[PDB]
Amino acid sequence: KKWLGTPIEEMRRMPRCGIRLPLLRPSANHTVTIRVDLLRAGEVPKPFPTHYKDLWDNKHVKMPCSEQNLYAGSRWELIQTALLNKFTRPQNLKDAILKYNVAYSKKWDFTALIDFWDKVLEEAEAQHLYQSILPDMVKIALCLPNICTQPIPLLKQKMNHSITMSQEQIASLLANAFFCTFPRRNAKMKSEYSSYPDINFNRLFEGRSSRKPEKLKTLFCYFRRVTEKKPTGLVTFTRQSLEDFPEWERCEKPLTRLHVTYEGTIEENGQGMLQVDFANRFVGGGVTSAGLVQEEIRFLINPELIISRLFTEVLDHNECLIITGTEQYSEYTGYAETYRWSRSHEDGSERDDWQRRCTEIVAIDALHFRRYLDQFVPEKMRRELNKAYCGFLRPGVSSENLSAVATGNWGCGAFGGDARLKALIQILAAAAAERDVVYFTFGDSELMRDIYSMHIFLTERKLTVGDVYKLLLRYYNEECRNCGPDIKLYPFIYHAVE
Ligand SMILES: Cn1c2c(c(=S)n(C)c1=O)N[C@H](SCCN1CCOCC1)N2
Numbered sequence: 300k301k302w303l304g305t306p307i308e309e310m311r312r313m314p315r316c317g318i319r320l321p322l323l324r325p326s327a328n329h330t331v332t333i334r335v336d337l338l339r340a341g342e343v344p345k346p347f348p349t350h351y352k353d354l355w356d357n358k359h360v361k362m363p364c365s366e367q368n369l370y371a372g373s374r375w376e377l378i379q380t381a382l383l384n385k386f387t388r389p390q391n392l393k394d395a396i397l398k399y400n401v402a403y404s405k406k407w408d409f410t411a412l413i414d415f416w417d418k419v420l421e422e423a424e425a426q427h428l429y430q431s432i433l434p435d436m437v438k439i440a441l442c443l444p445n446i447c448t449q450p451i452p453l454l455k456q457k458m459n460h461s462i463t464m465s466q467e468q469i470a471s472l473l474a475n476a477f478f479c480t481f482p483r484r485n486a487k488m489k490s491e492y493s494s495y496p497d498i499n500f501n502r503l504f505e506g507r508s509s510r511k512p513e514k515l516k517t518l519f520c521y522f523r524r525v526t527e528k529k530p531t532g533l534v535t536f537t538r539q540s541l542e543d544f545p546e547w548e549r550c551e552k553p554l555t556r557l558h559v560t561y562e563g564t565i566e567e568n569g570q571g572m573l574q575v576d577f578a579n580r581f582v583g584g585g586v587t588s589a590g591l592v593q594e595e596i597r598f599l600i601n602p603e604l605i606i607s608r609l610f611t612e613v614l615d616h617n618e619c620l621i622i623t624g625t626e627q628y629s630e631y632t633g634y635a636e637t638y639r640w641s642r643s644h645e646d647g648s649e650r651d652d653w654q655r656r657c658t659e660i661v662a663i664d665a666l667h668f669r670r671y672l673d674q675f676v677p678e679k680m681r682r683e684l685n686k687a688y689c690g691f692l693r694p695g696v697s698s699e700n701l702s703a704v705a706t707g708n709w710g711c712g713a714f715g716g717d718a719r720l721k722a723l724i725q726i727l728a729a730a731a732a733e734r735d736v737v738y739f740t741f742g743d744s745e746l747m748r749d750i751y752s753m754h755i756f757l758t759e760r761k762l763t764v765g766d767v768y769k770l771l772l773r774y775y776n777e778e779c780r781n782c783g784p785d786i787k788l789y790p791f792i793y794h795a796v797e
Contacts, residue, residue, distance in 0.1 A: 302560035303751035310558060310703035310735050312571030313657040318700050320652045323463065332449045332464040333533065338654060343529050344465040346448045354450035357491075360610055362451075363480035364444040374399055378480055382437045386429045389416040396479050396501075403485060408505035411515070419512045432519055435526035440474035447471060454538040454620070455612045456494075461537040462610070463653065466530035466626065469603045474522070476500050476587075481609070496581040496608035502588035509636070510591050516640040517599040521628040524643065532654045534603050534624040536610070541617055541692065544685045545731050548772070550764040554726060556735040557754045558703075561744040566597065566627065569705025570648070571657055572737055573691065575725075577709050578662035580614045582607050591638050592712065597660070600644070601625040604660065616682055619690040620662040624655030659702070663690035665710025665721070674716060675779040675788075677772055680724065683710075684768075687728035698733035707739040708746075718743075719788055722750045723771070727764050753789050760796060770795055 323338070325331040333344035355367040368374040381398035384391065393409040400407070416425055439446075447468050454460055475481060479499040484492050503514060565574045576582075577593045583605060584590045586598040598604045603625040611620055626648070630641040648656040663686050668674045674683075691704055706725055710716035722738060729736045740746045757767060774791050778784040 301562050302558060303747060304558045304754065305556040305735070307558045307560075307568070307737060310556070310572065310737055311699075312702050313659065314571065314649050314651055316571075316700055316702055317651070318696070323653045328460050330449070330452055330460070330462045332447065332451070332462070332468060338533075340650070340654060341531055343467055343531055344533065344654075346446060346465075346468070348448050351444040351448045352450060358453055358455070360451040360453065361482050362443065362447070363475055363482060365482075368482050370399070374482065378478070379441055382441065382478060386433055389413040392429075392433065393504075400479055400485070400501075403501070407501045410504070411506055411508070411511035412504035414507065415512050415515045428519070432523050432526070436474045436477060436522050439471050439526055440478055440480065443471050443475060451610055453495075453610050453612065454536065456615050456618070457540050458538050459540055461535055463533055463535045466525070466532050466534060466603060466624075469534060469606050470522075470525040470530065472606050472609060473602060474526075476605070476609070477518070477522070494613045496579075496583055496611070496613075497587055498606075498608045500587050506589070508589060510589070510638060513638050513640050514591070514599060517629045517631070518602060520640065520643055521602045524628055530626065532624060532626070532650055532656060534622065535653070535655060536607055537621040537623075538611065539619050539621060539689060540615070541685075541689045544617070544688060545764070547681065547684055547727070547731075547768040548765050550731055550768070552730050552733070552764050553761065554730045554754065554758050554764070554767075555733065556703075557726065557738065557751065558736070559738040559740065559747050559750050559754075561740040561742055561747040563739055564741075565705045565707060565739055566600070568739070569703075569737055572659075572702045572705035573734070574658070574660045575690065575704065575706035575709060576604075576660050576662040577707075578614070578620075578664040580664040582611050582614065582620055582662045591635050593634070593707075594662075596631060596634060596638065600629040600631055601627050601658075601660075607662075614662070614664050617685060617689060619686070621659065621690075622662070623659045624650075624653075625658060625660065626656050627658075661690040663687060663709070665714050665716055667710075667713075668715035671715060671717070671783060672779050674720060675771070675775045675784075677775055680720075680768075680771055680775075683721070683724050684728050684731075687725050688731055691729055691732035691734055693732075701732070701734050703735040703737045704729050705737045705739070707741055708743075717788070718746055719749060719753075720771075722746075723753065723767065723788075726750075726754060727767060730764050749789060753792065756793065756796070762796070767792075 323335045334347045337345045364375045377399045381395040397404045477500045584594045586595040626646045630644045708718045711718045
């Protein structure tokens, strides 16, 4: 069989499982950058306030259009002068970006941009790029002060805060990131923003990886779509930091339901479910540089995710980022060296009452294990349980209104995670958050069978979260602490219980 466990049709999903949203409203913990009183299906949202207001300080994004962005001269004026020239050759665009980035004229390589334009694209495609797409991108970038009129707070460490903005606002901000206009975000030895991801796209232009043309095709598909026809919806970005975590050894909650399959994907088959992003602590990972596995791919086919890098501080152990409403603009095949842009995607997701696409993604970063056995240390197991639990828990929401979790081999691959341990950690964390699990093994049919078999074994014997966590602790003591191990985890568990 291609899938085991509970039928996926029986799992909860949005919008059907959600409660009616309250009235969207700004508050101390919710920044809203549009006119809620004018929000209407199929209309471009109106920015609030009407006229640009600037904050240039330690708690907000430093906007390129700020009067305090100086070089004294006005850097915004220089950006306007640089970008409003006709581009007919890729050197023109390199020279323009470097006019307001003089300090990086040696450090920043543009080989991938030059090669995309001159050596990948056919003549007609290149003409469309520089006669239509790039000029349209410049115009939406330079509209920033009329589009993003309200200061954007940083989602700093330990903040429990949300930002809701329009897709159109995000497009203006991402156009600025493409043209590398965000100040104070470039220096290798920067301090103010050293704990924040890169936002400017300059590393997307460097080098000769065969992957860069596919990244650029994916992003220009998005740019071509959102400059041609303004998107009308909203997107919410929520930083969540929990202080009260389970006493896992004492948790008497039962396990929840499981659907596990080695076919399908989170983004296609997990529609309306809580979709896990296998994140870097710096959200988005290498999306704007080198990096093209699960997180980067999702950030490329849903580019509105990328703007989280503008304002999201590196995630601490007890934190996650929840993004609701991003739209899928691209389809793809493969991953890493085999990733290819396929075609434009027409997102058919419903929108909720805040005009957000019914797509919820949570970025949770797994640990990186130098040594395989390190991940069975109890402190490290607890850390991953608590990270997933934070990602899955929705304070204030009842379990019947919680979609299933759509996830997979989180932190396995480059990070060195063991898939069978990580599957059980997510199953336990979901159980504690009272959500069902939809698990994609991405071609690994044996893993599907193994996860299913363990899950049904444990549920039929009515073992609790705490019962299972204590078995993980026994495995650490017996096979790992004084030890790769002589016996694998699931065999150990079956033997210990039987
Ligand atoms: C869309 N998608 C997806 C993956 C997974 S696992 N899942 C569940 C998914 O839905 N992997 C790939 S990218 C790197 C490949 N690695 C192989 C499996 O270990 C994790 C990552 N893309």
